[PDB]
Design a binder for this molecule. Structure first.
Ligand code: COA
Ligand code: MYR
Ligand code: CL
Lengths: 8, 393
């Protein structure tokens, strides 16, 4: 599946 | 427990993946080819599920079945590291991702509770021709592996993987490609997500992004402001007449990467023809009437969990961007403007293909999520992100 990223 | 880092991955044993035809996490891969030969006979019986659960192929043409799948994913699919956001794939998006040309109903592999018929598990495969270094192979792409929260840590996911493998083997296919936010044996490439704020006040309010201590909200607004309309001459939405040239441009552009899709003209139509709130494609038609570039991005919103006011985040995801006459930087700048125009809160892109040439310049910030790329039953050397030329959903 995809992965949910957010700004470091 | 899952491993998001290679450090935490090195200290883990993989009871399931050790049984599978993938390389071990430790080894360096020196060869090219299948891990094991194609199977001459395939198990005819579906794998056994824990008592009280049953397999059920999902006909996504049935609106109510599609809505059950929407709900399973909306409540149980992928979340960020801090359990603040969850993917919210729309029903129409799921139809796009799960019914490309060649899709098979048995490859929409559901798990249901026998008594209540509640959908509690899912995995999918779609066919795809994959170019990996010097080899072109018919493969499947695996996506949407999901186990209901009440059902986790009961080794249901290994059963889902084996059952879809079985159903794919029955069609004579023995390799697959897939991504994951966790480290598994063994990534062929590791990509990093980057994020370009479009509505930075909302992003900061919902804690998707954080205001730096050395920056005010007012400076953050100015830093991310964009023009009102794109700058590229002749940019316009893709139309039916552009399908052949978009196919041609994409095919030629992808040859420079080492992991890419090989799309028929019908697959180009499926993946790029614009569908509102699913997939946007814009072409550059020049002064001679010739299409020389295109940009595309898909729509993937997310649920903001446990928040009283803001309930959803609208995200655009960079898909494929092909430049032959327009600089890639101008192309992506116009993509940002178009996404902002369409109401998106953030524009996401990976560091694959040539994306590193524009990420810092267009004010993307690096994300906390890696996307690992994997191949099943194919040994080959790993590659840098810039040679990965494959985007899934
Ligand atoms: C990911 C998910 C399906 C795993 O199910 P689970 O019940 O927590 O884990 P299980 O008890 O069933 O079994 C774990 C096995 O599956 C593996 N596994 C865990 N997550 C995996 C993933 N995303 N992809 C492939 N294999 C995975 C584990 O590594 C382990 O195998 P191992 O012994 O070799 O290490 C489940 O947590 C889920 O639905 N998460 C939200 C959606 C999601 O993350 N989907 C996958 C995106 S790649
Ligand atoms: C994200 O949803 C991807 C999860 C991938 C799970 C493992 C898939 C392994 C390949 C199975 C199919 C093999 C067919 C030859
Ligand atoms: Cl279907």
């Amino acid at each position: 599946g995809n992965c949910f990223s957010k700004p470091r | 427990g899952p491993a998001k880092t290679m450090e935490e991955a090195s200290k883990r044993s993989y009871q399931f993946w050790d049984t599978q035809p993938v390389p071990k996490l430790g080894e360096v891969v020196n060869t090219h080819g299948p891990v094991e030969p194609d199977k001459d006979n395939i198990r005819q019986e579906p794998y056994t599920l824990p008592q009280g659960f049953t397999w059920d192929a999902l006909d996504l043409g049935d609106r109510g079945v599609l809505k059950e799948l929407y709900t399973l994913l909306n409540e149980n699919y992928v979340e960020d590291d801090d359990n603040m956001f969850r993917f919210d794939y729309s029903p129409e998006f799921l139809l796009w991702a799960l019914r490309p040309p060649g899709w098979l109903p048995q490859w929409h592999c559901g798990v249901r509770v026998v008594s209540s018929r509640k959908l509690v598990g899912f995995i999918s495969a779609i066919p795809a021709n994959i170019h990996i270094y010097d080899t072109e192979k018919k493969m499947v792409e695996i996506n949407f592996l999901c186990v209901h929260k009440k059902l986790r840590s009961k080794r249901v996911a290994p059963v889902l993987i084996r059952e879809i493998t079985r159903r794919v083997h029955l069609e004579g296919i023995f390799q697959a490609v897939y991504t994951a936010g966790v480290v598994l044996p063994k990534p062929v490439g590791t990509c990093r997500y980057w994020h370009r704020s479009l509505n930075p006040r909302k992003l900061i309010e919902v804690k998707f992004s954080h205001l730096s201590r050395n920056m005010t909200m007012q400076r953050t607004m100015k830093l991310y402001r964009l023009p009102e309309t794109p700058k590229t001459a002749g940019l316009r939405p893709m139309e039916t007449k552009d399908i052949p040239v978009v196919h041609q441009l994409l095919t030629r552009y992808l040859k420079q990467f080492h992991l890419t899709p090989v799309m028929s003209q019908e697959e180009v139509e499926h993946w790029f023809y614009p569908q509102e709130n699913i997939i946007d494609t814009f072409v550059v038609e020049n002064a001679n009437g010739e299409v020389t570039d295109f940009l595309s991005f898909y729509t993937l919103p997310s649920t903001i969990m446990n928040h009283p006011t803001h309930k959803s985040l609208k995200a655009a995801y960079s898909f494929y961007n092909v430049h032959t006459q327009t600089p890639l930087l101008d192309l992506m700048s116009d993509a940002l403007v178009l996404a902002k125009m369409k109401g998106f809160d953030v524009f996401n892109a990976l560091d694959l293909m040539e994306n590193k040439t524009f990420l810092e310049k267009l004010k993307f910030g690096i994300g906390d999520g890696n996307l690992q790329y994997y191949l099943y039953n194919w040994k080959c050397p790993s590659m840098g992100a810039e040679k990965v030329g494959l985007v899934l959903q």
